[PDB]
Design a protein around this ligand. Structure first.
Ligand SMILES: O=C1C[C@@H](c2ccccc2)Oc2cc(O)cc(O)c21
Ligand SMILES: O=C1C[C@@H](c2ccccc2)Oc2cc(O)cc(O)c21
Lengths: 389, 389
């Protein structure tokens, strides 16, 4: 008559990542991009893109689309021409396949048999289908036929916080539950040619890359058997003021299109302080601890772009090293939408181990994961690190 | 450092429904359908459709598409011609608007101010967008900017069980949480003309209707203030054996397309017994109660079609009155995909009140809600009724 619930906080027990093999260096991208799109006569357009690549703080990105793949399918190299069936027929298979790579890495690391996975959350902004990427991934992995699945489509760059917000309740309210969390994104859904009044779509071409990340999330890790890396303690979601239409994304016959109608860095950086301050007030209330200072937290922040990071760092007065893990991931894979915060989480724990810092969170006990996306939606997750050795 | 959890079982505290005003009687539909599609010369095709309307056990359905709306947009009356941008530009506004109708009915009934809603789950098979129908609905309703939202897109006919499975954990693991659950479906996403090798799409034209349903789901109802109607006690999800490709749905440039590659009624009815028997074994284990007989449970079953209902009823040996509430909803609105089980739940409690039966579940204590869809996915929710007067 009942389902027993768990007792301890939803914990990240393993993380895996995966990227397409093809690497595109940002030094090379304005040439590759304008070359493969038959558009170098667009000398004016070409050079402000050159300038945004220069200021993108992305060094390289992994992309599924090859010179040869774009060679063979002209309608993506073209611009604003019917393309949805071709991208979907790519993305509906390549997105779950990339996610299966990350998932196998997480499961191996976790060390338990794949049949102990009781739930799956699959999150993507690239492609839609029925049955969905969740079912395609379960088929690829051979999960038990009764895993409870959830596919979160058309999320955007806040989706990495969204999957943690949901996984927390699945893990905490079901005794023994082990949640596979996968975020997988592939840029074939939005890749277009350049144009001189699609300069929203231009910024996309400078920052968006491909990748997938996977977590195992569970409460009450089996002692000496399973290993927790971060604990999910508090979540919050917010629609920022005066941000209507800031970030829109439409799934159209020409594919997925991308729109910025507001100064997204100003909106986030102006309002982020009040959000964090309230969240920490809830986690550390007077009635007891004072909340740690911003510099004494670890920061897992979605790098929508350099201008967001710089203005957040400026408005909150963060010491210049706090966004280091965030910036390293953007530099080496660019903006991978919902998957990005989980690459950052993985990078942060790996350095902490490698450099023998005191905790999985760079030596700090508490931290914040932030996702931003259409809405303008901001997802806040207060995390706790776990001590090392 | 914490989020308090709730103590009692996630309970349905209110239900509202809504349908487009335009009513189409099944007696009239083969003429209306073939008339508005320029296809009555298709005398052969026309008459087996006549036959499936005859055997559809649907009397009427509410549809957003009018004779005049189809008059004004020829590409939907046509068949298999570019149509996705037009349907989406319809559905991305009409689906949240229909859902806002049902939501306001649920909230009024609930009686608490709309700002006490802390979470939203919006489920639909009709349209996708960013920001999503969840955000569009929150905007229409004026919910607090910090409601935690979740949009479940491209679910299909099992989605009504899916939203309960998720809402259960949100309500139960967050003290004070009140979840708005909305399922909204509008058939403009799939409406096509007829063809003589699109006879999957033909069955769709006989059974699919429009509608939206909304729930308020919360744990620990405030005594004498809030009223519970059903309690969610156990959930389970299953991919039925040998059902690969049974039910596929693709979002294409011509719109959303619908495919049956297996005998869906045989697959469900052959395997449903083992699922129910296992579920009840878990809810009522020996260690104590024996599980109630099938005839002593109330049944809230998704009416994919008459052939599913009849073979389930036959293979499980259910007395002929058990699927009565289910069949009444299919008769008066047809298959409304994810919303249908919640119309049935609403119909069942309303009769129980009207006829002064002992419980919200027709006088029975325990019941089953079943959703079926692509996968072949079966969602099982063991519910408990609440006693009346
Ligand atoms: O336009 C899309 C692009 C998409 C993506 C990026 C990388 C790989 C696949 C897909 O991410 C987004 C995030 C948003 O917050 C808004 C968007 O409109 C998009
Ligand atoms: O083809 C769609 C139709 C959709 C619907 C019905 C009514 C109103 C809007 C949308 O419901 C479905 C359920 C499925 O299990 C599989 C499907 O392929 C569909």
């Amino acid at each position: 008559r009942k389902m027993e619930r768990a007792e301890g906080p939803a914990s990240v027990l393993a993380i895996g990542t995966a990227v397409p093999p093809n690497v595109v260096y940002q030094k090379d991208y304005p040439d590759f991009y304008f070359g493969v799109t038959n558009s170098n006569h667009k000398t004016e357009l070409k050079d402000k893109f050159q300038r945004m690549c220069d200021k993108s703080c992305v060094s390289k990105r992994h992309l599924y689309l090859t010179e040869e793949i774009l060679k063979a399918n002209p309608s993506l190299c073209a611009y604003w021409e019917p393309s949805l069936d071709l991208r979907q027929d790519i993305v509906v298979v390549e997105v779950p396949k990339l996610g299966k790579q990350a998932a196998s890495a997480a499961i191996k690391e976790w060390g338990q048999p794949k049949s102990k996975i009781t739930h799956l959350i699959f999150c993507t902004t690239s492609g839609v289908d029925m049955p969905g990427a969740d079912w395609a991934l379960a088929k690829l992995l051979g999960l038990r036929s009764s895993v409870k699945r959830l596919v979160l489509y058309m999320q955007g760059c806040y989706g990495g916080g969204t999957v943690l917000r949901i996984a927390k309740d699945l893990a905490e309210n079901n005794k023994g539950a082990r949640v596979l969390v996968v975020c997988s994104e592939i840029t074939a859904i939005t890749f277009r040619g350049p144009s001189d009044t699609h300069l929203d779509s231009l910024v996309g071409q400078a920052l968006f890359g491909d990748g997938a990340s996977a977590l195992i999330v569970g409460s009450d890790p089996v002692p000496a058997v399973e290993r927790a890396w971060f604990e999910l303690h508090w979540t919050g979601s917010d629609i920022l003021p005066n941000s209507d239409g800031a970030i829109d994304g439409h799934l159209k016959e020409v594919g997925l299109t991308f729109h910025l109608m507001k100064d997204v860095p100003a909106i986030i950086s102006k309002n982020i302080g009040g959000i964090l301050k309230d969240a920490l007030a809830k986690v550390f209330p007077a009635a007891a601890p004072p909340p740690p200072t911003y510099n004494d937290l670890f920061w897992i922040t979605h790098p929508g772009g350099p201008a967001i990071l710089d203005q957040v760092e400026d408005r909150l007065g963060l010491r210049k090293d706090k966004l280091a893990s965030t910036r390293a991931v953007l530099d080496q894979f660019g903006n991978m939408s919902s998957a990005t915060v989980l690459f950052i989480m993985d990078e942060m724990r790996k350095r902490s181990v490698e450099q023998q810092l005191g905790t999985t969170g760079e030596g700090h006990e508490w931290g914040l994961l932030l996702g931003f996306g259409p809405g303008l939606t901001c997802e806040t997750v207060v995390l706790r690190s776990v001590p090392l050795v």
